[PDB]
Design an enzyme around this catalytic site. Structure first.
Site, PDB file in Angstrom:
ATOM      1  CG  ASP A  58      11.918 -15.001   1.616  1.00 40.11           C
ATOM      2  OD1 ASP A  58      12.708 -15.936   1.867  1.00 40.11           O
ATOM      3  OD2 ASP A  58      11.245 -14.949   0.566  1.00 40.11           O
ATOM      4  CG  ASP A  92       6.150 -20.422  -0.846  1.00 44.03           C
ATOM      5  OD1 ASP A  92       6.941 -20.286  -1.803  1.00 44.03           O
ATOM      6  OD2 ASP A  92       6.063 -19.597   0.088  1.00 44.03           O
ATOM      7  CB  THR A 115      16.323 -19.554   0.175  1.00 45.86           C
ATOM      8  OG1 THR A 115      15.344 -18.791   0.892  1.00 45.86           O
ATOM      9  CG2 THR A 115      15.675 -20.161  -1.061  1.00 45.86           C
ATOM     10  CB  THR A 116      16.617 -18.780   5.557  1.00 47.67           C
ATOM     11  OG1 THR A 116      15.842 -17.757   4.920  1.00 47.67           O
ATOM     12  CG2 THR A 116      17.298 -18.197   6.784  1.00 47.67           C
TER      13      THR A 116
END
Lengths: 78, 76, 517, 521, 66, 66, 41
Positions: free
Chosen positions: D53, D389, D86-87
């Protein structure tokens, strides 16, 4: 040629692409020699088709040959 | 060998990557496998486990050796 | 390792410094030696007992070995200035270094194209040479005696020459061939016509621009209110060598049809000729009868086989241009003349023009008895005209002592007023180097240059254009009252050499080191 | 030619920070996608953690580089707004920094570079809205399928049948209409040990974290209750200095008891005058929260008592319940209370958790607290993060309606359209539109690299298929190639791709605007 | 206050030509001191063009000449 | 930013005058004050005479600017 | 005020030549007169 003529290479190139598309299809190049405006076609500046074709063929023929050499062997001095 | 002291990418710790970490993972599991390489099967032989105090012990069980084996490595 | 054998290419960062700072360091050797109050330099060899001390700029630069490849360029510029006149070599190298000193500011903090910097000087030097002409004075005063002194000098130049037969007639032709010009004395304004079957004393002077060839077949011999057009094209049988071509046609009549189509293409160019409203056309090549017959209906007389020098001299007398192409109708520089009359001299038809627009020129027709009398006279006449023209260009001086250097600055600042965007700093930088010439002259004098040059600029800016710097009293006084003058030819030579030296050096993005000989 | 030399080099210092920032994106590049490679990070304390993550990597990376710290703040804003991606937002930032390196080599000032990214980001979102498939919150079948696919990436799969409508029905009650951003902090996921996954209760009104009084006199239930929040603690006087209680005589014993019982009763009397049925006492382990004598006093007055309330929930209960914090009993009145029809203690298995329903307040709105149960501790944990999520994906649809097909589908088509629309521009900006389109292709190219597929081959297959079709093809690791992501149930909401482009243009701007750094203390 | 002047670098250059007017009639050694003050006034539009990402030498030269 | 230069400490105290009198445009004051130093450095290095005379040149030039 | 810049530093060359020449004159200074000091080479 635009950098050596004192013009923006990105700005002039993008300008010439808009003159040959939105307006009409023609030949308008960067200004190598001092003149009032663009459109070298009005100046009757021509280049030979066999001359320009010979340039792009030798440039491609050499670019391929450079890619065909991945190894360099250089002997010393005895 | 032993990539260290990177002039760029300023961080609060060292950072390695590439084929260096992949080679250390093979060298780490090789030394661990060599400890249990001779202990495999009933034909295997016992080994000595020495601590920092200076004492030791002798056992042929591969489960007790790996538990007391000191290995510092993320894959180890 | 590019090049080799002592040849190498300087880095783009170091080449600009070698062409500027490296050239200034060479100019710094002659910097403090400029002027009669200048300092001296020392030249020492390995033996150290052979040394010498001299202020000569040509001796210091040539003796010192220069490892800088850009420094060898200034050596060639010094040789060009020495060919013109043996004085002023120091002032050229110093002025060239001042132009390159500001050129460093014209790149770093400016971002101006280097060729535009040269074009900025070409427009600034043109205004600088024009400012020297307006302020130019002369010792030619008492011209009534000077006009008489020229005919006696011309007689001395005729000694040992076959023209010595009659001195009075030939010296009058050479004297009237100069003073009557009221302008450039170059031989391009004087046409020479060599003819046979006569006597040398029968020669006469004619300003009507006599040329040998005639025009037209059935055309009239007189043209009133002529409009002259100058162009170069082949209207008769282009591609002078047709051998080797292959024309694919079903019959011979179709081969001539392509020639008729070529004649139809002639009307495209002929129509552009008639749009100019001309009764006269000039062509270097020939013209076929069919396009010439169309000129008869349009009333256009075509003078053919004028070569090139004959064309350029025709454009100067009539105020025309040598352009060989038509860019657009009713846009061009046209000449004209009042009357075109065809005469005959030496059993050959000649053309005598009359009433050229703003024409200033003359044509000396030499009538000899053989080719030896014609060839030796033209070579000796140009030598006599060169001596007479030497007294017109030389002994004509300008106000010195910082005056002319500052007067040019005012004209360059005027050029710096109306200018395009990128050349504003390039033209202004040229005026800065003009003010540095009296600054360095005040350096070796031992006075304050920043006080004298600043007051000199503000004095000439508003009125008082004749003021200059006085190095004896250390103040500003009138140069006409003190009698301080410097040659005009020296001023033109330094400005021209500085523009030629800056033309090569400013275009440099890299320096190719010369091969040692 | 001869141009501006720039003797001082503030830009070269910025280029060093760009390379240092691109080095962080290269490390996160391998972690993109579900098949991305894990990263090993050893903390200074000695803890060894690992995960793919990007939000957890950048948080524990402890970057000392100030420009590279902006990527952590963008990942924090990426999780706070969209909740996912976010990645990919960090990788997209590194591509714009890499494309800006070529712009700086052409003599382009970073101000135009940052200003052109503004028009490039606004145009990329407008093009994305044209291809986006509009969906509405009134359709409950689309929300369940969107939440079910987010729960298929976790160990719990077959049990998500009851988990999918849980996140859907919880948002539909708090969504109303035209609410724009809806804070997921209003949704409280309560983790309790025991029970199973199939046992869940929404309890839209509110849910507490604590049990009731286990001492003598605890009501454990109350009807028609008013719930206040008391930050104070009812205890006999205990100064922070040194104190001691010494009873040498019978008169000394009664003196201590009468002073303590009267001080506790006087506080209890002021509570009854305000008609306070239920009291919430802040948990303090230093001193006594509620004395046992106070429990017997508040039991005689028929006042329900719940003590040891977690300090983290004090801020949450003051919002959802619409009440106000009470520092002192003197300012403690009825106006700061709530309204509750029934307050009871319900224990599914062993939990003994208190629930409250019917807040009945105009200022307080339906703040929902969801209870999550499970056998093992690893169940309620992963379930909480999986449902979190799922709430982020649904939150994207509430603020911005519509969804797109994930797997790198929009990145290819937008890059193809901006390349054709670049001819409509002129000058320096026109070349930036071409580099901005090439910078959008790093996300689909990395997905093909981290999945083992051929990099150059898969990317060309996307440009080939997206010409005839529109958003019908993408990269899917299930089929090991280019297929239809809509048929494979891969759905990425439009707000994720919108926020990823918006935060990328703002991140690269904050980077390029730094021309120098100096020590400031 | 609320009494304003024409902005956008104009008044900055208007002062430059006004100081250049002061540099016209000036003492001998005070010419460079006054002229340099107009140079600092012309550096204000140079900085505004550099921070905006444009060419200061092209704009200011065309702004001064106008 | 801590400034070890004693001349830079004076520049901070000068910027406090603009904050107390008005409080807006202090950045433009510091920039223009630095641009005057850029020209004053060019006037000194090219002269090396006491700047007090150059100060009188700025006073006469500032009056024309106002 | 405003004076000449003096970018070059010619004084270091002149002052080095004057001091070096002054040491020669000071060496010959002791030889002045019939009673002066004799120098050995």
């Amino acid at each position: 040629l635009a950098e050596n003529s004192g013009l923006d290479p990105i700005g002039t190139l993008s300008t010439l692409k808009s003159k040959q598309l939105k307006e009409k299809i023609s030949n308008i190049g960067v200004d190598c020699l001092g003149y009032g405006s663009n459109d070298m076609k009005e100046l009757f500046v021509v280049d030979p088709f066999i001359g320009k074709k010979q340039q792009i063929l030798l440039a491609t023929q050499l670019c391929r040959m450079i890619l065909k050499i991945d190894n360099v062997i250089i002997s010393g001095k005895d | 060998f032993n990539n260290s002291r990177s002039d760029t990418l300023f961080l609060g710790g060292e950072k390695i990557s590439g084929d260096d970490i992949r080679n250390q993972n093979v060298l780490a599991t090789m030394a661990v496998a060599n400890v249990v390489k001779s202990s495999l099967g009933p034909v295997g032989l016992d080994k000595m486990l020495v601590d920092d105090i200076g004492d030791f012990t002798v056992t042929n069980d591969g489960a007790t050796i790996l538990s007391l084996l000191d290995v510092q490595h993320p894959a180890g | 390792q590019i090049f080799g054998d002592q040849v190498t290419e300087e880095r783009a960062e170091n080449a600009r410094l070698s062409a500027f700072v490296g050239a200034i360091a060479v100019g710094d050797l002659v910097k403090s030696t400029l002027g009669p109050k200048g300092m001296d330099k020392l030249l020492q060899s390995a033996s150290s007992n052979t040394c010498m001390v001299t202020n000569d700029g040509a001796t210091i630069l040539k003796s010192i070995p220069l490892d800088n490849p850009a420094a060898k360029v200034l050596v060639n510029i010094s040789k060009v200035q020495d060919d013109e006149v043996g004085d002023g070599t120091t002032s050229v190298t110093v002025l060239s270094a001042e132009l390159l000193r500001e050129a460093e500011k014209l790149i770093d903090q400016s971002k101006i194209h280097p060729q535009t910097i040269i074009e900025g000087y070409r427009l600034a030097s043109a205004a600088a040479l024009d400012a020297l002409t307006k302020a130019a004075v002369d010792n030619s005063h008492d011209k009534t005696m000077f006009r008489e002194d020229l005919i006696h000098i011309a007689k001395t130049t005729l000694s040992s020459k076959i023209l010595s037969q009659d001195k009075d007639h030939f010296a009058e032709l050479a004297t009237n061939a100069i003073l009557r010009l009221k302008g450039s004395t170059n031989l391009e304004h004087i046409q020479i016509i060599k003819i046979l079957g006569g006597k040398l004393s029968d020669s006469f002077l004619d300003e009507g621009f006599i040329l040998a060839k005639k025009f037209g077949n059935n055309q009239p011999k007189r043209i009133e209110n002529a409009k002259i057009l100058i162009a170069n094209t082949t209207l008769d049988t282009d591609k002078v060598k047709i051998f080797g071509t292959k024309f694919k046609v079903d019959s011979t009549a179709k081969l001539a049809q392509l020639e008729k189509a070529e004649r139809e293409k002639m009307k495209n160019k002929i129509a552009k000729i008639s749009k100019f409203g001309i009764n006269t056309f000039i062509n270097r090549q020939l013209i076929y009868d069919y396009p010439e017959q169309l000129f008869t209906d349009l009333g256009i007389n075509s003078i053919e086989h004028a070569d090139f020098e004959g064309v350029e001299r025709l454009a100067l007398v009539t105020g025309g241009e040598v352009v060989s192409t038509f860019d657009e109708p009713s846009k061009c520089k046209l000449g004209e003349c009042d009357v075109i009359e065809e005469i005959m001299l030496g059993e050959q038809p000649f053309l005598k023009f009359s009433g050229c627009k703003a024409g200033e020129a003359c044509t000396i027709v030499l009538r000899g008895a053989t080719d030896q009398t014609l060839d030796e006279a033209e070579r000796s006449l140009h030598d006599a005209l060169s001596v007479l023209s030497q007294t017109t260009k030389e002994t004509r001086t300008v106000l010195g002592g910082g005056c002319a250097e500052m007067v040019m600055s005012k004209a360059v600042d005027t050029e710096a007023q109306n200018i395009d965007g990128k050349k504003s700093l390039a033209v202004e930088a040229f005026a800065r180097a003009l003010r540095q010439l009296p600054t360095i002259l005040a350096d070796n004098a031992g006075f304050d240059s920043s006080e004298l040059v600043s007051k000199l600029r503000s004095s000439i800016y508003n009125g008082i254009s004749t003021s200059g710097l006085d190095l004896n009293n250390g103040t500003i006084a009138d140069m006409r009252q003190l009698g301080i003058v410097e040659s005009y030819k020296l001023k033109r030579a330094v400005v021209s050499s500085a523009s030629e030296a800056a033309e090569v050096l400013l275009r440099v993005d890299n320096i190719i080191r010369a091969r040692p000989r | 030619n001869a141009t501006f030399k720039n003797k001082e080099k503030p830009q070269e210092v910025r280029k060093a920070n760009i390379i240092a920032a691109r080095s962080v994106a290269d490390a996160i590049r391998t972690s993109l996608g579900p098949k991305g490679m894990d990263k090993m990070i050893k903390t200074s304390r000695g803890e060894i953690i690992i995960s793919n993550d990007g939000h957890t990597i950048l948080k524990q990376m402890a970057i000392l580089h100030p420009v590279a710290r902006m990527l952590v703040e963008v990942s924090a804003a990426q999780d706070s707004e969209a909740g996912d991606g976010t990645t990919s937002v960090v990788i997209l930032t590194g591509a714009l920094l890499g494309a800006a390196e070529r712009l700086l080599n052409k003599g382009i000032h970073p101000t135009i570079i940052a200003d052109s990214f503004q028009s490039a980001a606004k145009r990329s979102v407008d093009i994305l809205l044209e291809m986006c498939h509009k969906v509405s919150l009134s359709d409950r079948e689309q929300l369940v399928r969107a939440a079910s696919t987010s729960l298929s990436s976790k160990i719990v799969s077959q049990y998500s049948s009851f988990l999918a409508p849980l996140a859907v029905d919880s948002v539909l009650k708090i969504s109303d209409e035209n609410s724009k951003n809806v804070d997921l902090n209003d949704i409280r996921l309560v983790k309790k040990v025991g029970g199973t996954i199939d046992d869940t209760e929404m309890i839209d009104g509110v849910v507490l974290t604590q049990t009731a009084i286990k001492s003598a006199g605890g009501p454990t239930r109350k009807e028609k209750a008013k719930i206040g929040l008391i930050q104070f603690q009812i205890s006999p006087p205990k100064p922070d200095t040194e104190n001691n209680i010494i009873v040498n005589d019978y008169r000394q014993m009664d003196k201590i008891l009468k002073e303590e019982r009267a001080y506790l009763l006087n506080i209890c009397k002021k509570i009854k005058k305000a008609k306070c049925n239920v009291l919430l006492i802040q948990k303090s382990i230093l001193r006594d929260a509620v004395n046992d004598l106070a429990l017997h006093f508040l039991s005689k007055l028929n006042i329900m008592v719940v003590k040891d309330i977690e300090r983290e929930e004090i801020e949450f209960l003051s919002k959802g319940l619409g009440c106000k914090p009470i520092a002192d009993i003197e300012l403690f009145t009825e106006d700061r209370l709530g309204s509750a029809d029934l307050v009871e203690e319900i224990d599914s298995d062993g939990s003994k958790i208190v629930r409250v329903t019917g807040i009945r307040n105009n200022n307080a709105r339906p703040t929902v607290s969801v209870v999550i149960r499970g056998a093992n501790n690893m169940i309620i944990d992963e379930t909480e993060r999986s449902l979190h999520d799922a709430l982020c994906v649904i939150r994207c649809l509430v603020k911005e309606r519509g969804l797109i097909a994930g797997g790198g589908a929009p990145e290819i088509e937008i890059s193809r359209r901006l390349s054709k629309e670049a001819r409509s521009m002129e000058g320096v900006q026109a070349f930036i539109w071409q580099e901005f389109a090439s910078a959008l292709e790093v996300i689909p190219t990395t997905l093909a690299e981290n999945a083992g597929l051929n990099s150059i081959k898969v990317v060309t297959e996307l440009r080939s298929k997206h010409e005839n079709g529109e958003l019908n093809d993408g990269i899917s690791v299930r089929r090991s190639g280019t297929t239809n992501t809509y048929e494979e149930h891969i759905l990425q909401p439009v707000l994720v791709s919108t926020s990823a482009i918006t935060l990328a243009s703002e991140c690269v701007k904050s980077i390029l605007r730094i021309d120098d750094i100096a020590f400031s203390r």
